[PDB]
Design a protein around this ligand. Sequence first.
Ligand code: NAG
Lengths: 50, 41
Amino acid sequence: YNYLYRLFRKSNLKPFERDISTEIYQAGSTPCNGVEGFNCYFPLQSYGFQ
Amino acid sequence: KIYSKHTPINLVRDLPQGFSALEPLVDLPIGINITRFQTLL
Ligand SMILES: *[C@@H]1O[C@H](CO)[C@@H](O)[C@H](O)[C@H]1NC(C)=O
């Protein structure tokens, strides 16, 4: 699980754009206020290579 | 990227109406994003 990819963003990366920022992704009308919930999710996922 | 020029002047109030082209000093592969800046003195 040391290897991860971003699953959510407001808009696509431009050519060679890099974006570490760890903000919890608000998908819906309800804000995250720093934690997951109703239509709100952590920005990354992992391949979990087996 | 960065460019510059220097010149002597006589008028003190604001920029002297004339022409003199700026030449490059630096290019960097920064990747970082700029939206704001400030002067240091
Ligand atoms: C710079 O960063 C902001 C987020 O802080 C982003 O919204 C904006 O689109 C970026 N600007 C450029 C020119 O990529």
